[PDB]
């Protein structure tokens, strides 16, 4: 796609390492820093995907 393709995604941050051959798809925000966001995704609340 001349404008690029954005349908192919990857998760970035998670709580711990992945077990061998186990999917961990989830829809929520990452707890980083000192602000456990409730979906606000503000500062220190990065989207995993």
């Amino acid at each position: 796609k001349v404008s690029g393709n954005y349908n192919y995604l990857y998760r970035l941050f998670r709580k711990s390492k992945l077990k061998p051959f186990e999917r961990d798809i989830s829809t929520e925000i990452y707890q980083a820093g000192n602000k456990p966001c409730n979906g606000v995704a503000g500062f220190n609340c990065y989207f995993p995907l």
Partner: protein, 98 residues
């Protein structure tokens, strides 16, 4: 009639759904929000009437649920011609690498 395996058992974590039939099995994986509505009758007592057929009311919702499985029945309801020799059904469940 069956067993449930999973975590938090909601439409936010991948969940199992294992139910045993007369002679079948309907193991599946889904993200159903719940299915705990059997609708117990006001006269559900078996002393008067034991009639309880297809009392499932299951998989109310399925947002991302495609993985399904069916096979032959697991439990073989058998009778020793008396209740004293009850079928000591024994099962062992472990879930290493699928």
């Amino acid at each position: 009639r069956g067993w449930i395996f999973g975590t938090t058992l909601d439409s936010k974590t991948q969940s199992l759904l294992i139910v045993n039939n007369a002679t079948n099995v309907v193991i599946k994986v889904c993200e159903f929000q719940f299915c705990n509505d059997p609708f117990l009758d006001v006269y559900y007592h078996e002393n008067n009437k034991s009639r309880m057929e297809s009392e499932l009311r299951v998989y109310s919702s399925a947002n991302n649920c495609t993985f399904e499985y069916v096979s032959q029945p697991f439990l073989m309801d058998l009778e020793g011609k008396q209740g004293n020799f009850k079928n000591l059904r024994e099962f062992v469940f472990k879930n290493i690498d699928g």
